[PDB]
Design a binder for these strands. Structure first.
Lengths: 170, 282, 60, 165
RNA sequence: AGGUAGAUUACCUGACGUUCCCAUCUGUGUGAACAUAAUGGUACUGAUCAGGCUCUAAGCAUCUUUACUUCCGUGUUCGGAUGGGAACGGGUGUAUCCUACUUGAUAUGAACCUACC
RNA sequence: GGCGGCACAUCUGUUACAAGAUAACGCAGGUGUCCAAAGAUGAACUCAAUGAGGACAGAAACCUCAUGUAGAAUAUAAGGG
RNA sequence: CAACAUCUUGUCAAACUAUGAAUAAACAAAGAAGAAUUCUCAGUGUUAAAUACACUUCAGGAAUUUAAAU
């Protein structure tokens, strides 16, 4: 009857973001790859503060999407497979999340036409526990206790336990 | 190192806490003060609200009017007492919310004694069409407001299923039929969900799909032997058995003390013992 | 020819020579602008009472 | 030389009380006012609609009419050498019940309790109780004797000056 | 003892750890329809396999904070009044009113209607 | 007096004296507009900033968590909300 | 080294403020005509319906007590 069941970690959100500095053509295709990879329409993110150094307010810059549940675990493994389960100790946030990056998306390399192109992607994994809804529910929204909230090493141990991935300190 | 902690004493000396219930996350004090405000020229004439709150397992419906001392409850009705009327499982359905609302209307009119001239609708073929009580002779029906609370009002929400039951019981609640289970298609779309037609169309579908899923989702229904053809008739009889005996029905409560406060003598001695421990330790 | 702009000197002494004239009681008992329904009830009763009182007068 | 704005010189008058911002209590909109009551006008700057003029702030008036959302208040205003009657219509957020008659209504109740007991005593034939005595300014206290067995003496003399530095 | 609705709006807040859940509440399973969004995360609806892990509630601490009492201190200032002292500046005496900041001790909620235990 | 300026119609803070009134060609500033939405209503959300993470990406691009009593925003001068 | 946090110290604000006097401002201390109680009680309207409540010369009418309330 031990209550460790309610303390099991689980990936509840995986966000994939492609940031390109130009609006149109490149952003149109950068959305298509994210739709083909996951299966849901991404979000065209517009700039918040214009910067002449990067040649960017109202213009749409990036595209992102979040997948949850069984689909989140599938795409995370694909992103980890190309990384070969090689994650630095620095990649893990002090809150209990982590992320990494990808330069070439594997997807459909067969019909690699110049129209589709090659885009780099970044994976960010937001972990959780059963009981985290108490901060997201509309009625009686509260704060999760400090002990229940994750930590840097709690995520690291989860990474080494479910995927048998090592953490390097270089 | 760098902390720049914005939680210092200078931060608290000017902090302004919110209202206790709003600080708790239970009451919207911006819409509440619109549901409370009786006209000033109607001195101490109560303004009634149907406080419809749905927990994970019950449908709490109450009739309240506000005073400076507090809120006074004129009548109440829960779904956990529906087994007395023959409904044993699915106490939070769209079908069980209609029974909870209708039971409250008939329980209330029995108290005021106006339950013989205000009867609403009773037949099962008119469960889907709009009904609002009107003047009988020259006596207006009981008027009440729907307090929804922190619940979004979508076009299927159960808080309007409770409202539909109250209006069918003969209690006037101003509304529009654009947020019921219908508000599209017609009566039979609204009628089917009131009679549990949406629950007794998923048991059949699940039984076709999988046996594990069917027993996982409706495990206690199978033990009770409620076939997907009995739910529709169950709510017909429950409605019949409410309009005939709504007025309630039927000791020592076992306390469990938790900690109790420490007195000054015990609290002071804790410091002294710890201080003495520090002396010998250091 | 610059002149003195304004002074409140001797103003209070003037105001108290014939003191602050309080309003009469009739000022506090006006009814213009009262509640519409309250005035309707009052008119209905005063009309009812006057008709009854006049009826006795004609009777006797 | 100020200006002639409707809300001139209200940097400190209209400021909310310290840590008293936000919504007001619900007793403000739930208190029941009747014609003849005593109220105090207290402008609530958080409600800019129907804000009474700043000269009526803190003035104690009488309720002369009760409308569906507004309370009529009758206050005295001073003019050149006379006093005029001002009739307002204020929402309940900007007013407050007045305690000007708090003690008077208590002495009204004391005399009513005595009068109620007197009629019962007169029926019984027994002598009636007297009405409570009127309030008086602090009277010259009468002569009193002090028992010296539990009396302690402390001499009082001027003190030697001591420097504050 | 718990839940719904509240009134006072920190004695009710914040940080650190801690105790039960037997009912209740919560977290909990799911996505077929109402409904929902980029995402069943939210909101919606259907349910009951498990759990007191977080909620929630009760308590701990030479806890910041907050709320009353004393002290600060009749010390700051002030209403009234000289043919009173001083070249000024400014500051007495007389009949009176009397703060604040800090500090020390105490507390950390009381209370209203309905249902269940 | 003239030249200069508008204290001439007018708003905010201060002079200003804890009701109201209130001087100087006293001080620091403001107006002759702007808005079919920047009016009305309903719903959802929470802001500035800081910390820690994510390929190009760096002090500044976009994504995520946490703290966050308003330190943001509210057409405009200042003061209030 | 700085620099950043944090704990003290010294001195200030007409256009800074938690706190906040003294002096003041506006009420009450019994005028639908100097109180109170008891009985009876009508017209409208609020109200789910009211005998509650609101206004009506504290609608009205009749008795007893009463001149008191710094």
């Amino acid at each position: 009857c031990k209550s460790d069941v309610m303390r099991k970690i689980k990936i509840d959100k995986l966000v994939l973001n492609i940031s390109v500095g130009e609006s149109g053509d490149r952003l149109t295709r950068a959305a298509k790859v994210l739709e083909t990879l996951t299966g849901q329409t991404p979000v065209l993110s517009e700039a918040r503060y214009t910067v002449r150094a990067f040649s960017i307010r109202n213009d749409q810059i990036a595209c992102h999407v979040t997948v949850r549940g069984a689909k989140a675990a599938e795409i995370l493994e694909k992103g980890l497979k190309v990384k070969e389960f090689e994650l630095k100790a620095n990649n893990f946030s002090a809150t209990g999340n982590f992320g990494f990056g990808i330069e070439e998306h594997i997807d459909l390399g067969l019909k690699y036409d110049p129209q589709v192109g090659i885009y780099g992607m970044d994976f960010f994994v937001v972990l959780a526990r059963p009981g985290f809804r108490v901060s997201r529910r509309k009625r009686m929204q509260d704060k999760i206790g400090r002990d229940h909230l994750l930590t840097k090493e709690d995520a690291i141990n989860w990474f080494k336990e479910t995927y048998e991935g090592i953490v390097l300190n270089k | 190192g760098f902390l720049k902690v914005i939680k210092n004493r200078a931060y608290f000396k000017k902090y302004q806490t919110q209202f206790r219930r709003r600080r708790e996350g239970k009451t919207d004090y911006y819409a509440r003060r619109k549901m409370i405000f009786q006209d000033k020229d109607k001195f101490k004439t109560p303004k009634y609200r149907v406080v419809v709150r749905i927990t994970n397992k019950t449908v709490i419906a109450q009739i309240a009017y506000s005073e400076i001392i507090g809120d006074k409850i004129l009548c109440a009705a829960y779904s956990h007492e529906l087994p007395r009327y023959g409904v044993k499982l699915g106490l939070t359905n769209y079908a069980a919310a209609y029974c909870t609302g209708l039971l409250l209307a008939r329980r209330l009119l029995q108290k005021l004694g106006m339950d013989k001239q205000f009867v609403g609708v009773s037949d099962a073929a008119k469960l889907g069409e709009d009904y609002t009580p009107e003047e009988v002779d020259e006596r207006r029906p009981f008027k009440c407001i729907l307090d929804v609370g922190l619940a979004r009002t979508t076009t299927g929400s159960k808080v309007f299923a409770v409202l539909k039951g109250m209006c069918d019981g003969g209690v006037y609640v101003p509304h529009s039929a654009t947020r019921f289970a219908g508000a599209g298609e017609n009566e039979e779309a609204l009628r089917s969900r009131i009679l549990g037609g949406h629950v007794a169309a998923y048991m059949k579908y699940l039984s076709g799909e999988d046996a594990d899923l069917y027993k996982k989702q409706f495990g206690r229904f199978i033990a009770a032997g409620i076939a997907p053809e009995a739910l529709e008739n169950i709510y017909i009889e429950a409605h019949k058995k409410i309009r005939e005996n709504p007025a309630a029905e039927k000791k020592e409560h076992k306390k469990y003390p938790t900690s109790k406060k420490l007195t000054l003598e015990q609290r002071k001695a804790a410091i002294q013992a710890k201080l003495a421990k520090l002396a010998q330790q250091a | 020819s610059k002149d003195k702009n304004r002074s409140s000197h001797n103003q209070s002494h003037k105001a108290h020579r014939n003191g602050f004239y309080k309003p009469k009681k009739s000022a506090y008992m006006s009814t213009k602008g009262m509640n519409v329904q309250v005035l309707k009830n009052t008119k209905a009763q005063r009309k009812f009472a006057l008709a009854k009182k006049l009826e006795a007068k004609k009777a006797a | 030389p100020l200006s002639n704005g409707r809300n001139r010189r209200t940097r400190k008058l209209f400021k909310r009380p310290f840590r008293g911002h936000g919504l007001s209590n619900t007793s403000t909109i739930l208190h029941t006012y009747k014609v003849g009551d005593y109220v105090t006008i207290l402008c609530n700057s958080s409600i800019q609609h129907g804000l009474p003029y700043k000269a009526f702030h803190g003035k104690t008036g009488r309720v002369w009419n009760v409308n569906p959302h507004a309370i009529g208040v009758m206050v005295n205003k001073k003019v050149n050498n006379r006093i005029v009657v001002k009739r307002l219509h204020i929402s309940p957020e900007h007013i407050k019940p007045s305690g000007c008659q708090k003690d008077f209504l208590e002495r009204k109740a004391a005399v009513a309790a005595i009068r109620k007991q007197n009629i019962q005593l007169k029926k019984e034939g027994k002598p009636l109780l007297p009405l409570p005595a009127k309030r008086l300014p602090k009277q010259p206290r009468p002569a009193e004797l002090i028992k010296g067995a539990d009396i302690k003496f402390t001499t009082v003399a001027p003190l030697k000056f001591e420097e504050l530095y």
